[PDB]
Every structure is written in structure tokens, then in C-alpha cells.
């Protein structure tokens, strides 16, 4: 039973499906992600108050 | 009577007022400006309206 439980929880992580993934919405130390500096990406993120 | 003064405190996740970006612009888009007294010394009560 313990081996079966470990095997069914053996999945490391599930691939992010997009910006609506709850994992990205709450960044933590276990999963770190960031931009470079001031990419059209940073400008877009500036106007997103959410 | 048009200018209705509003008092607000920043202690809960309902106001995320921060500094402004020194890029020859007021601040981020679609955001109303405010002001806050800043204390210089523990004895002096003079505070600039930044």
C-alpha cells in the first residue's frame, strides 16, 4: 500500500497551462520565476494591478 | 463642496500604495494620486507632502 501511494504521488509537478495556473499566482521559494529587467513584459506587468 | 478629503491607512491588503517611478511621469496608468507626511527626525514634526 505504501509503495502504491508513493507511486501514485510520484509525479514531480504538473506543467503550467498558462497565466491562470494557481501555482504561478502564488509564487514561493520552491518555484521561483522572474523576468529580465524592463522587457515589454515588465511594462505589461506594471499596468496589471492584480 | 467638490474636494472631499479622504483619510486612509495602509495596514491591510486593501491599499498597496507605493512610491512613484522617476521616469518624467506622475505614476502608473489608471491610478489616482495621494499624499503622505514623511517624518525627518524624531523631534522635528515637519513633514513634506510627497
Amino acid at each position: 500500500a505504501n509503495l502504491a501511494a508513493f507511486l501514485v504521488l510520484d509525479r514531480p509537478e504538473e506543467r503550467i497551462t498558462g497565466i491562470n495556473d494557481p501555482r504561478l499566482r502564488n509564487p514561493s521559494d520552491k518555484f521561483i520565476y522572474a523576468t529580465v529587467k524592463q522587457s515589454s513584459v515588465d511594462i505589461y506587468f506594471r499596468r496589471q494591478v492584480c | 463642496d467638490n474636494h472631499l478629503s479622504i483619510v486612509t491607512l495602509e495596514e491591510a491588503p486593501f491599499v498597496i500604495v507605493e512610491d512613484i517611478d522617476p521616469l518624467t511621469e506622475t505614476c502608473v496608468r489608471n491610478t489616482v494620486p495621494c499624499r503622505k507626511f514623511v517624518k525627518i527626525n524624531n523631534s522635528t514634526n515637519e513633514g513634506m507632502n510627497v
Side-chain angles (χ1 to χ4, degrees), chain A residues 1-9 12 14-50, chain B:
Chain A
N2 59 51
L3 290 182
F6 293 155
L7 224 169
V8 304
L9 69 89
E14 189 266 348
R15 291 89 63 88
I16 281 82
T17 180
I19 197 59
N20 60 330
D21 194 306
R23 181 184 300 179
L24 296 185
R25 304 301 297 269
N26 294 261
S28 180
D29 300 0
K30 301 179 59 60
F31 192 89
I32 51 183
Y33 61 95
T35 336
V36 261
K37 223 43 107 20
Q38 306 72 321
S39 86
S40 165
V41 183
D42 181 71
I43 303 300
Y44 168 71
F45 286 167
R46 282 297 178 181
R47 277 74 179 271
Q48 294 291 340
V49 296
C50 291
Chain B
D1 44 357
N2 301 332
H3 302 263
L4 301 182
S5 56
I6 298 180
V7 48
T8 309
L9 170 59
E10 184 187 6
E11 57 90 17
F14 297 92
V15 276
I16 49 179
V17 47
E18 299 293 339
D19 301 330
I20 59 180
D21 43 351
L23 300 180
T24 67
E25 57 184 357
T26 59
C27 64
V28 297
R29 201 256 300 182
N30 63 267
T31 303
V32 294
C34 51
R35 44 181 292 269
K36 173 183 178 181
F37 291 86
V38 281
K39 197 174 187 60
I40 301 180
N41 191 22
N42 49 17
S43 59
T44 62
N45 50 16
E46 176 68 24
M48 299 66 61
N49 301 331
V50 47

